[PDB]
Amino acid sequence: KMERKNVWHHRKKEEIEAFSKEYMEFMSKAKTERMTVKEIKRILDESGFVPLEDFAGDPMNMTVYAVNRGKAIAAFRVVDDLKRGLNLVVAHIDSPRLDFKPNPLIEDEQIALFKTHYYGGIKKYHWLSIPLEIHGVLFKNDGTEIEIHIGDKPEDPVFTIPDLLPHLDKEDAKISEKFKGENLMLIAGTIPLSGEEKEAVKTNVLKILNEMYGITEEDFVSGEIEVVPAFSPREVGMDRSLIGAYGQDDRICAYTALRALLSANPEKSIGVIFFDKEEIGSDGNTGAKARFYLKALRQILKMQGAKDSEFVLDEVLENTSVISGDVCAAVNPPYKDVHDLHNAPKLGYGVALVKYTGARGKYSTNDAHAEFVARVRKVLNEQGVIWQVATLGKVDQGGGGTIAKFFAERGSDVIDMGPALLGMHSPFEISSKADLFETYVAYRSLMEKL
Amino acid sequence: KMERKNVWHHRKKEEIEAFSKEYMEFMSKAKTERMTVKEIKRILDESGFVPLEDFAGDPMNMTVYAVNRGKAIAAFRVVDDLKRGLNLVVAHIDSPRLDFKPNPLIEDEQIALFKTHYYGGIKKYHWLSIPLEIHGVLFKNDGTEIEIHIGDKPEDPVFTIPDLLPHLDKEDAKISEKFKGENLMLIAGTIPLSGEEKEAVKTNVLKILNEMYGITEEDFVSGEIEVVPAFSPREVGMDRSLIGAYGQDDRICAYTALRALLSANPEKSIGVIFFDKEEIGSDGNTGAKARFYLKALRQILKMQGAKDSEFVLDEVLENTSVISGDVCAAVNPPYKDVHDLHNAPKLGYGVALVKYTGARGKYSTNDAHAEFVARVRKVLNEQGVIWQVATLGKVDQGGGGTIAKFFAERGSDVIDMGPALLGMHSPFEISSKADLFETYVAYRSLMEKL
Amino acid sequence: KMERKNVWHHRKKEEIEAFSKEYMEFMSKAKTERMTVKEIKRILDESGFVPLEDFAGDPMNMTVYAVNRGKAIAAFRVVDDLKRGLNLVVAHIDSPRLDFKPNPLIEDEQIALFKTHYYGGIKKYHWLSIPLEIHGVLFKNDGTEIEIHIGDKPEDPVFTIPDLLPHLDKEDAKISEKFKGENLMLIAGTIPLSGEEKEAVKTNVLKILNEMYGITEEDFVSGEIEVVPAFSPREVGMDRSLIGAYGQDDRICAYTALRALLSANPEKSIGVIFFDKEEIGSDGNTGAKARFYLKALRQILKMQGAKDSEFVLDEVLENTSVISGDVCAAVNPPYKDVHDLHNAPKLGYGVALVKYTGARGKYSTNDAHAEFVARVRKVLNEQGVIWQVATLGKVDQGGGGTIAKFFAERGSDVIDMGPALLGMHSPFEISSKADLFETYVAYRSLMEKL
Amino acid sequence: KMERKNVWHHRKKEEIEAFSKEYMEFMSKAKTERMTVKEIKRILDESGFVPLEDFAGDPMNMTVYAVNRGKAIAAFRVVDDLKRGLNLVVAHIDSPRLDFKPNPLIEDEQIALFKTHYYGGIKKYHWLSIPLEIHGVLFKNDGTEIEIHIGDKPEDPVFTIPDLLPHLDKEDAKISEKFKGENLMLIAGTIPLSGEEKEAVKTNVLKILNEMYGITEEDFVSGEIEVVPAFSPREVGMDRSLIGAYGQDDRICAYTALRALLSANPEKSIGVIFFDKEEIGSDGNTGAKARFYLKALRQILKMQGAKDSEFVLDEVLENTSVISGDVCAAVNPPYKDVHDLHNAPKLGYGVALVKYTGARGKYSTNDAHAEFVARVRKVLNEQGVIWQVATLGKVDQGGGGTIAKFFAERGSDVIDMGPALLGMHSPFEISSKADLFETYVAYRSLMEKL
Ligand SMILES: [Mn+2]
Ligand SMILES: [Mn+2]
Ligand SMILES: [Mn+2]
Ligand SMILES: [Mn+2]
Ligand SMILES: [Mn+2]
Ligand SMILES: [Mn+2]
Ligand SMILES: [Mn+2]
Ligand SMILES: [Mn+2]
């Protein structure tokens, strides 16, 4: 008994392949959280969703969405009274990146550089000597919004933070020292602008930016630009069983959840909420823990006749099951020693059910209740969903931490659930096509029969 | 001339003893938060309490309780308009222990073992070579609930995590290294099944668990089992002045508070709330950071006719005095240099009044206001309660942190109060019978006089 | 070819179980070398034995015994003249423990304390924060003997050596440092006698001790009090195949040898000798090398007509096969590296036959001769006794040393043999019921057939 | 209320003083075991003792002595059937010193030096730059015996091992390094012989030793010379309360015992045995591990008509109480943290009753039984002897180990008793005049009352 089935042996190859190409197409547009919101919203508009604010026409049946500030977005399919509660799948759309500084442009030794400040649990050495592209937006003083996208197009140049050749790198310190956040600067120019006696190369770059976007240097301050890997999603492996791409840290869950939401046949209200800032603690007004979430829900309660928002919300949240959809780590052979094999997920064996994460003895982590796990286990088994238990490394390996805790905090039962990755947080995260497909299945089954 | 008074010299040996036996009897039942709740409930059911969800009586005079998820519980004796506030004593009913992994059963070197994942700030070396009890619940796929209690009965076997004999335990690492969470596995069985050629021993335990609970290996995933010391409460010392027992960390405060709640003659509404998860940060929907707390008060308010829950709450919490009932550290002679003797509690000298905890200089902790302490100082003195001021060690020694900050965060004045233990977080914590009693006396008078 | 059999597959579950209940009854009586001698003495008395000191019958068929100083005891069943030598199995009845110092009572920080001095190879951290009980004897200045047994009964208070709470335990030292033998003091009392200007608590404890035993502080000098863990023997495991108890380190070999002595049907004289002082190197009056052993044999020889004691003895010992009892170490999965699996004993695979108890290349050990092992191997095999070979860990892992050498030194052939333990020297040692039984089965065979 | 009594307040200053001068006079003679024996003999010859080999008197009333090899001696006052046992006090007459190598004379940098090989646990740095005496015997090939005593007479020169002046003694190593045995060489001479062209200085010393003792260089091989401090016994302190002297380590016990043997009025046979070699393990035919001890008793037994020596011995040793007379360590104020003040002896507070020594928890040491201590406690108290309990430092501090275990090994009950020194093993050990006296008083009463 107690054996894990391999998805490739219980699901249609063609179905997996198809769903796989749709995912990667999406991962081609979703490099930042602003692009993911944009890309999700249009998929919603395309599927007949309308802004919750603009909705008119009977609650008890309304498919709407609420965009936070371009950084977060919540989509619901209200099918009944919210006091009946709902099935939610929460995920995050921010991934480790680089981020320009308020004053990014500088020149050092006749070379224009863009200074950055890493974001999230990055691994410095991953971002040295690889083709990067930049995305983001800048506002002119008058308030004109300027979008930037350089590197995603073949006629576009890419950027780079060149490593030091090994011939003159005569000094090996701990991975800690060596690789300083400050030296993560993209080369921006090198060509001096004839006639300038002070920082000719920097000036020239500003000249190009001004002729190209009508922007001036002070416009970087009132703007945000993210540096990401130019690698495009690709199939991986001789058997083409895996997917390689940047930002799979939850965009893989966001995508699957989105899809599950669009094909589900609910019984009670359902929805998905994609948050930002999770990679740095979920602070700010666009991450989990922000009033945003309960505000969207309160808005609905009023349209449904709720007299006392907060009181009614108590039942809404009392009922309502939340699936914290985030990723975990798959046993990586050369480093199998970091896991407890009897509780570590394997690529291809299905969605991982992660009861508790955290660190040093379940510190600051949400631990799902046996009653909830039971209810989740029953729906999955009845729907023939293929899943596997998943722990975040041997007892004291570390890591741990999702957004699930911020939801149990509001009174709802939550459980972490998603596919296992390889090389998480790197510029090219690996995932299994089959698991990617089964997560979608799982989320849909839970949204429906939970 | 300010000096501390010894409770034994001011309270009647026979009343302390009676209270001790009642406490120890309670402690023989409350070994986990689930068992504690169930035990606190039957005591509440007697005494005449009814669920808040099934009240239907006079909203101005109700003695009710709310059970979160079998892991937390709130009990109030509402005898006025809650707008006038409550007098609440709060504590936690969870203690450092060992939890079974989702997949706990494995076999190694022909021996069945149950893997664990320690919960809370335990001292790993305490759990090696001591009798252990298994407690918890398992859910079979169909939904069936199965309670497990093994080792707490004379006709029951116990479990152990045998340490390595000193003869081959060469090489002495720091306490950090040595003693690794991963190695905290209980021996499940050693007898192999006849005919079985693959894990004959693990197969046997499964055969046994099945002929006993009708469960299969996978039921552990949708289960929550906790390992606890087989030690039962006992008197300690030649003068029988102390109590040795597992989980005194707050269940001692929970008991004294519960008792004070039942004995009190309150002028205003009083109540006690017992939380889960504090030993890991209070995260989770059963922690003192979850909606549950304010959910219950809002519930009571509507029954009293509140029209705008939130607004009415601002006042309820504005008034209302919360007593954070948690234990502090008494001076352990051999390690007395860890304390500031002029600000450290002593066994037998009364309840400890703990103004602020935290570390490195009041970091992340509630620091009682001088005026709130003043009100407390006056009640205790007026009723002749034996108390003493306590601190959690010398300035930069260690780090405390109770749930007090979670209620102060909600607008109420809060202070930490409880008995002083010796060997906190170990399998056999020590407390003073005299302090036990006086804590109850303190909680009751504060409930009635604040 | 060549494979160990599991005793559970070749022995009646009813026999093993019953013999186990009896051994456990015994272990709840033998917690110190004195109580063990006392216990063994009555089992002998009830079985027909009488003191060698006052035997009268035929010196060719005598079943006597000789207690040394209430700490050691030799029991023989002379069935022929000792010149034919006899078959003996020797074990030790002392176990690592804590001893009260001559002046054990002191007070510090208003806490009565009992200073100890550990005995044998204990792991100091094992004794912190666990229930303890004291057993021993004190003599008044007039010669009166006072027995002390506090903690072995429920009504009795138990003692403890509270560890420091993790919160304030800062310095991360290595096992060597930290856990100072000096800090292993039991808490004596905390209540202060009113009216006492100095050391009020200590006076109260002496006041309690004097009303209970009429003793005075000086009576501890002419006394011997041992500190033993409070917990009693319990079955262990889901399959209940193991036994957990303090002092299994040879009280187990002594018990099985005893029972084997009573039910054996000898062909030549046989006997069992239980020694003291083994955990410290067998020094003193009651040790394995304390003259007591040969004094008993000479006595018996003289009762048989021995003219030149020492000369005759030369032959008595020339013949005479000695089986050194004592336990060995089983493989503890998480620490299996410590062992050479091909030469290490497994729990439940029979009596361990240890040829030598090395230490860095067999220093100071009794390596049994091939021809003597062959003799033993023939008997065990022919009698169908299940056994396995066992070495005390990998080559330079650690030390070892049974009393066997003290007997080979006297001219006899010796060989180490007993069951395999887990967590040796801890307060809760683990052993297999099956092995417990086969050791008894093995001793009985060898006595009857060597 | 238990408290120690100060001998100076209970024994008569004039009797202590008289005893002190007699002791110090003895100590001026006994500087080595060979000199001590010779000195103990003439005192025994007076007082009326005769060699055991030349007795020929009443076997039931003999006061004899046995000299081992001029290095050990036994003296008994047999006044009954030895079967009734003896009351023996044992001590050693050897002390830490420096021995001449077999070939001790060498020359280096034009200076004759005598190489040495330290004996016993000395502190090398004590022997640098202090006056030294040379004592011992040399045998010329023909067999002639030549006693050497140089430095103990005013008209004698002394020797020295000059340390390096601090000015060039750069580099500070641990006490281990620095101070090397090999470098403990006494300056023999510095004057060169006229005409000599090879080692003119070593040649001179040889010429001198020859015109003085008629010896040649090779006679040192068949010789045994010991280097000893030139310091002579002296009163110490303003109150003249102490005694400073070399070799107090036991010669203080040997003296007090000898004196008690001569003063006593015994009920049963009493005696004292003085051993050699204890300072290195008691190995050798003059140590307390050699046949000598039992050889003498067997001798006495035959004279009493014993037919079977060994058998009769079992009883002799069965009865017979042995007092291990050796010194313990008094608290040295500046280094008082090395002791457990509640169990450490103090100068002037009587003989120390030392139950067990050894290290790491009673390893390799005799641990007196409670009943034996009881008998001792009673005699001392009954005769009003001032005594105190002593321990050799805190639990894991150091390591003791007296010859007590060698007699307990032979069947007799044994306990350690002696005065408390300060600076043991140094060239000038300190003892208390009051303790000196009281030791003698204790030994005598025990001899007469046990
Ligand atoms: Mn991440
Ligand atoms: Mn994530
Ligand atoms: Mn705690
Ligand atoms: Mn607590
Ligand atoms: Mn042992
Ligand atoms: Mn042993
Ligand atoms: Mn010495
Ligand atoms: Mn000595």
Curated annotation (Swiss-Prot), chains A, B, C, D:
Zn(2+) binds at H92, H167, H425. InterPro entries: M18_aminopeptidase_1, Peptidase_M18, Peptidase_M18_dom2. Its EC number is 3.4.11.-. Its cofactor is Zn(2+). GO terms for biological process: proteolysis. Pfam families: Peptidase_M18 (PF02127). It is an enzyme of class 3 (hydrolase). Keywords: Aminopeptidase, Hydrolase, Metal-binding, Metalloprotease, Protease, Zinc. One of its GO terms (molecular function) is aminopeptidase activity. One of its GO terms (cellular component) is cytoplasm. Coiled coil: none annotated. NCBIfam families: PRK02256.1. PANTHER family: ASPARTYL AMINOPEPTIDASE (PTHR28570), M18 FAMILY AMINOPEPTIDASE 1-RELATED (PTHR28570:SF2). Belongs to the peptidase M18 family. This is Probable M18 family aminopeptidase 1. It comes from Thermotoga maritima (strain ATCC 43589 / DSM 3109 / JCM 10099 / NBRC 100826 / MSB8). The lineage of its organism: Bacteria, Thermotogati, Thermotogota, Thermotogae, Thermotogales.
